Amino acid sequence: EGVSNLVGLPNNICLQKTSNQILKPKLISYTLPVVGQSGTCITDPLLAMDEGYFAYSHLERIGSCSRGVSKQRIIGVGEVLDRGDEVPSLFMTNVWTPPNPNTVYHCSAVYNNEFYYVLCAVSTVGDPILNSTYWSGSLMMTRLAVKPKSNGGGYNQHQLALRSIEKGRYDKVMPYGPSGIKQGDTLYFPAVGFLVRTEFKYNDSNCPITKCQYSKPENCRLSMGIRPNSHYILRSGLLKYNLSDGENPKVVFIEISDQRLSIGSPSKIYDSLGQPVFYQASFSWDTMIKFGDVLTVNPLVVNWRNNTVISRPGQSQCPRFNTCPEICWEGVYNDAFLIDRINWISAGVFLDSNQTAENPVFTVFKDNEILYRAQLASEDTNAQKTITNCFLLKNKIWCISLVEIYDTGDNVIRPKLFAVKIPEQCTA
Amino acid sequence: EGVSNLVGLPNNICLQKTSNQILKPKLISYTLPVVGQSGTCITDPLLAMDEGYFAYSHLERIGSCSRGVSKQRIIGVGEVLDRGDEVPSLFMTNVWTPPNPNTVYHCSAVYNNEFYYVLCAVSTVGDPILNSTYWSGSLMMTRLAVKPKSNGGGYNQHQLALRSIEKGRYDKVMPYGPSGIKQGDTLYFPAVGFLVRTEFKYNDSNCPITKCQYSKPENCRLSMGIRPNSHYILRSGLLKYNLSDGENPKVVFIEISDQRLSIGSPSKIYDSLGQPVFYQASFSWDTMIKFGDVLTVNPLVVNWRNNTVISRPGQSQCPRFNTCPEICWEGVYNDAFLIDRINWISAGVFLDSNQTAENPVFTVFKDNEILYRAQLASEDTNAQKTITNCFLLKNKIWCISLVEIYDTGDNVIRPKLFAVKIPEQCTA
Amino acid sequence: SLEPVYWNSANKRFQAEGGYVLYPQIGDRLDLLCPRARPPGPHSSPSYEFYKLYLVEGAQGRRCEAPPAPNLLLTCDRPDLDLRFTIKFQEYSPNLWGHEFRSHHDYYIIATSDGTREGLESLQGGVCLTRGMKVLLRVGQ
Amino acid sequence: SLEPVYWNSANKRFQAEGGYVLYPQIGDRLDLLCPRARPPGPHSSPSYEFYKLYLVEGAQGRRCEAPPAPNLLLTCDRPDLDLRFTIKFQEYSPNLWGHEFRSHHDYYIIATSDGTREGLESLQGGVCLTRGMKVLLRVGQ
């Protein structure tokens, strides 16, 4: 009953731009049981997958999703199995709730050896992003067994407090994104560097105003922090964690290259078809999807797809499709999982609105073509962060997308899970 | 013709509680002439007394006492004289009327050296209390000679602009009360401080709820501004003004001690029997009379009487006699004057009504007893602000109360003066 | 003269034809009462009905709609206690806001709460619509 | 459903009777428009009027003043283009600050500049006072 990573040469998928409803999403949430009295909101979602195992995390709130009171933090893992239906489904095996739900933030997950490793920020001054200057820089790593042993002592659950942190010219450093990858015995977590704004080194003339009246050369630099006046700037990157660097191994921050540079955002690094891809959410003026093959890791350089079809809703300054350098900080995280490297086709769930968080559409796409798609709900269904991961089941490509979704007036708000087999035929 | 301050050991007064009509008030308003066509309303009344002199002010509105058109402002000084009758009476010697009636607010007077000094607020934005965030914070002084020279321009009427103001942590600062004191050549006006609400410093658990169901600990802190969402809170205190400090002296705000703290309100500091006394109007939930001996000045701290018999008409939330912390801003200024410090007996005019401004009764009292009293008028006669000052005429205690007063029907609404001699005998 | 206005469903003076109209004289007093209704005496209702009463411009009174930062007269928080509020139609008042009563103008005392603890802060027609709980005041010229 | 707000002096709904009140239902959308006015079509104003639109507390709406680091909805720098912003009264959003609407709370949208490229970054009552340029939001329970 084993799901496998997306590797080698899977079955054929339709490579034709079509309008036929070949895509037939399935709702499989149920196998991830979730309770909550009315007026409960479940958010800050995380889903990760590797080798037929998953990590998961959410923050359960009472009140609004934005400001509501943190009731509990779930951090769990389990396996991705065939539910007998020849359909992929998740199955929890190990969960862990942190003592104080208010202290943990921005968790990130990577799998290695019968273990998922969840690296979080620890903060008593709130979200480390929103109160940058007052955060300890304090990190923490949990390590859950994907197949819990009937009690061993440190196996099933284990914690490390993270002593040393090679962080270079960056003041503070933290995990910023759903999941990363392993390289043998090295873990790479999506992450972010906090660099004092004054020490930010930028030739304002590298800003792409060249077809943009109203955009001023200063815009790119200013849009590298949450406010123009902000104390730090954010630089996306990876946090390296060597498991063989002793009992107490160091984390090392690796900044992303200054190619097509946005303000540090929640990002993903993942293996598809024998080579890592890297996604970075678009949280300012560069609103077309930013992902593409990883050329090299330890000097971190990403070959950004020159996509012209996929975007996200912003607000007024930088809405969906905006390409001109404006000074802003807004957006959502709808990632995209590469499924065909020969033809560069990727699958994701995107929000078909300009300035609004609604209408989740599971879309399969190429750089300048959307081949096929599938509305997950209704036109005015509310949706936010979406997390897509792809794998194989009997050499057939499946995708599981976690989607922040509800339509106005349901009692408990919470993310749902969609399994979406990728079709071989282009027809019926 | 010889009135002096209340000092030393005067003639004896009745120390008994009694029902006998021993108090016989006299009307004397006419000696202080006032005019006005029908529908004219005279308000914002000031009355100060010191060393046989008096300060007076008022605002003539045409229309309602609240919102009628400001016709003119009066600031006047003169002397308190044995009118021949052996009865004290007010005689005007010097009147100044401001250019704009609309710009002058919240005047306060203290007398020094053949000169009354009148501190006022200058405002092109309406009552600074009601429009705090738009007020410039600009003050203005006026020096009127109690005995005008003949053809002595600057002697008679002089005015500083008020250059530097020491307001400390406070954003704006202004006079708030009829009258203050002098110590040598230093002047002390009653004043209030405008503190940004978010910088106010209050341990909510100091709100005395212990016997008050329906009272919440947040009540006191929220009642410190005119609304729970006022941008400022009001802290009462003093404005110190040294005359010997250049030709351009420095106003310095002294905030009041946090013992029995209430929302900054019109207050009065005054010399009685050779020691200063402070009174604060009760403009929220602490509706019993707030006054007592000033323990010290330049750190201002008042030894509030534990008085359990005098209060003032509020409205629904904080009506007369309310003692429980609520969220409210409402009441009237009904000051009282110490007349015997050995027994701590005081006199004032108080409105005999829970939630309505009417039934002005001149009353003499101790902390836990009313000794004796006299209704100045009818049970349903309208009355509002009352300012009472006491002194000596032939070593006999006399009080002069300025009472806002009218009864429905009459054409010009104006404040009236009452002289009340304090009875030595408890008898006929 | 003017009678006490009892503020609960039990009144029924509300469900009347013209719609509870008082014509106060200059000099008249007025009481609005929120009677115990805990140890249930006379004049109290089936159960305590949580209200906030506002004085309203009449135009807004018709629309059953309090303006922002309204003129709150009385707040029936306490099911344990009798609450009251008294106005006198006069120039003086322990009110510090400087409100005024135009003559030949209409004012309404309205309650926009649904009468529940959770509906209390409602600023737009509740029982004012539901049970028609408003009172027009036309004050002597 | 909800009518779009054309944010310029030509609007007229600003200095009307009630003073521009909106009762958004949970789920509704609201579009704020700063229309062209350079190649002038309808809804546009005499000249281009420079505004920043802030979403505000309500008490802050009264005071016609927006806090430091305000909730900036829409900047109007571009006389050439039509500019628009859209809110859905809902829990999810492209906004990264995590504000929120409360129950029975009034909020305001306001403009506090004087309508000029120079006095644009002003946070205290400009056109808010001068042209009554503030809208009141009372959102479904």
Ligand SMILES: *[C@@H]1O[C@H](CO[C@@H]2O[C@@H](CO)[C@H](O)[C@@H](O)[C@@H]2O)[C@H](O[C@H]2O[C@@H](CO)[C@H](O[C@H]3O[C@H](CO[C@@H]4O[C@@H](CO)[C@H](O)[C@@H](O)[C@@H]4O)[C@H](O)[C@@H](O[C@@H]4O[C@H](CO)[C@@H](O)[C@H](O)[C@H]4O)[C@H]3O)[C@@H](O)[C@@H]2NC(C)=O)[C@@H](O[C@@H]2O[C@@H](CO)[C@@H](O)[C@H](O)[C@H]2O)[C@H]1NC(C)=O
């Ligand atoms: C959702 O937001 C989108 C983004 O629109 C643009 O971005 C925003 C901020 O990013 C800015 O406000 C503007 O830059 C602009 O609005 C959708 O915008 C679409 O709007 C239209 C204009 O109304 C745009 O028209 C274009 O069409 C021609 C080709 O342009 C080029 O092609 C596109 C796509 O292939 C490419 O991205 C880019 O390289 C070029 O824009 C025209 O040549 C051109 O001018 C027009 O040509 C006329 C004839 O010569 C001439 O008379 C005028 O000069 C113009 O009319 C150009 O402006 C279009 O590019 C945008 N679409 C896309 C995919 O980007 C918008 O969705 C549209 O709204 C509706 C409602 O009215 C319809 O226009 C249409 O269904 C959609 O296009 C937003 N959605 C809603 C509901 O509000």
Ligand SMILES: *[C@H]1O[C@H](CO[C@@H]2O[C@@H](CO)[C@H](O)[C@@H](O)[C@@H]2O)[C@H](O[C@H]2O[C@@H](CO)[C@@H](O[C@H]3O[C@H](CO[C@@H]4O[C@@H](CO)[C@H](O)[C@@H](O)[C@@H]4O)[C@H](O)[C@@H](O[C@@H]4O[C@H](CO)[C@@H](O)[C@H](O)[C@H]4O)[C@H]3O)[C@@H](O)[C@@H]2NC(C)=O)[C@@H](O[C@@H]2O[C@@H](CO)[C@@H](O)[C@H](O)[C@H]2O)[C@@H]1NC(C)=O
């Ligand atoms: C209007 O103002 C006053 C309001 O007083 C109170 O304040 C408001 C807000 O703070 C609040 O709603 C209530 O607390 C109350 O209205 C006059 O109200 C007075 O009348 C009653 C309450 O109705 C009295 O309350 C208590 O009296 C005694 C003792 O209480 C002590 O002692 C007093 C004085 O020493 C002191 O204030 C405090 O230490 C403390 O309150 C009772 O024992 C007590 O319970 C009563 O005892 C009997 C015997 O068992 C029981 O049957 C039952 O439990 C209960 O009746 C309290 O009830 C007064 O305290 C209060 N006045 C004063 C000076 O404090 C109100 O006048 C009253 O109105 C009339 C007509 O109805 C009569 O009630 C009475 O003649 C007046 O007191 C004023 N005018 C009007 C028209 O409202």
Ligand SMILES: *[C@@H]1O[C@H](CO)[C@@H](O[C@@H]2O[C@H](CO)[C@@H](O[C@@H]3O[C@H](CO[C@H]4O[C@H](CO)[C@@H](O)[C@H](O)[C@@H]4O)[C@@H](O)[C@H](O[C@@H]4O[C@H](CO)[C@@H](O)[C@H](O)[C@@H]4O)[C@@H]3O)[C@H](O)[C@H]2NC(C)=O)[C@H](O)[C@H]1NC(C)=O
């Ligand atoms: C706190 O203090 C400030 C004063 O410093 C005050 O601000 C004023 O607010 C009022 C609204 O309450 C505002 O009134 C509007 O003014 C315009 C007049 O246009 C010009 O006049 C100003 C001086 O007269 C000038 O300074 C400006 O350049 C301005 O452009 C008027 O058109 C409005 O009228 C509206 O439409 C019709 C008029 O026919 C009326 O039915 C109705 O009156 C409408 O409002 C309106 O009158 C005034 O201009 C503000 N002044 C300034 C300098 O800010 C606050 O009101 C005060 N807050 C409190 C609680 O007291």
Ligand SMILES: *[C@@H]1O[C@H](CO)[C@@H](O[C@@H]2O[C@H](CO)[C@@H](O[C@@H]3O[C@H](CO[C@H]4O[C@H](CO)[C@@H](O)[C@H](O)[C@@H]4O)[C@@H](O)[C@H](O[C@@H]4O[C@H](CO)[C@@H](O)[C@H](O)[C@H]4O)[C@@H]3O)[C@H](O)[C@H]2NC(C)=O)[C@H](O)[C@H]1NC(C)=O
């Ligand atoms: C980023 O993170 C920092 C914290 O690191 C945070 O700063 C805090 O801000 C709040 C006020 O906004 C402070 O809380 C108030 O503190 C004062 C007294 O100070 C002391 O409070 C603690 C008591 O346990 C101490 O441990 C501290 O060391 C400190 O000395 C209180 O008077 C106050 O009560 C006031 O009144 C009422 C409640 O009665 C409230 O409505 C008000 O909020 C309040 O002012 C509060 O308890 C806290 O102490 C600050 N900490 C420091 C080191 O500055 C920033 O807000 C945050 N920035 C962002 C954008 O999130």
Ligand SMILES: *C1O[C@H](CO)[C@@H](O[C@H]2O[C@H](CO)[C@@H](O)[C@H](O)[C@H]2NC(C)=O)[C@H](O)[C@@H]1NC(C)=O
């Ligand atoms: C799409 O478009 C860019 C630029 O057009 C293209 O080229 C860039 O990427 C290379 C690999 O890192 C750089 O060596 C090269 O300098 C850079 N182009 C410049 C400086 O003009 C990318 O390849 C990008 N990817 C594809 C495959 O679509």
Ligand SMILES: *[C@@H]1O[C@H](CO)[C@@H](O[C@H]2O[C@H](CO)[C@@H](O)[C@H](O)[C@H]2NC(C)=O)[C@H](O)[C@H]1NC(C)=O
């Ligand atoms: C009545 O009120 C209080 C309590 O009975 C008295 O004590 C207070 O005043 C003292 C200064 O004179 C302070 O040192 C104390 O902190 C304070 N006591 C407390 C809060 O319990 C006060 O003397 C009395 N006032 C009068 C005039 O008798």
Ligand SMILES: *[C@@H]1O[C@H](CO)[C@@H](O)[C@H](O)[C@H]1NC(C)=O
């Ligand atoms: C960056 O760009 C300019 C012009 O391209 C170049 O001369 C210089 O090296 C840099 N300018 C500055 C101000 O650093």
Ligand SMILES: *[C@@H]1O[C@H](CO)[C@@H](O)[C@H](O)[C@H]1NC(C)=O
């Ligand atoms: C406020 O008061 C409580 C007890 O009343 C005390 O424990 C605390 O130290 C004070 N300061 C706070 C809450 O910061």
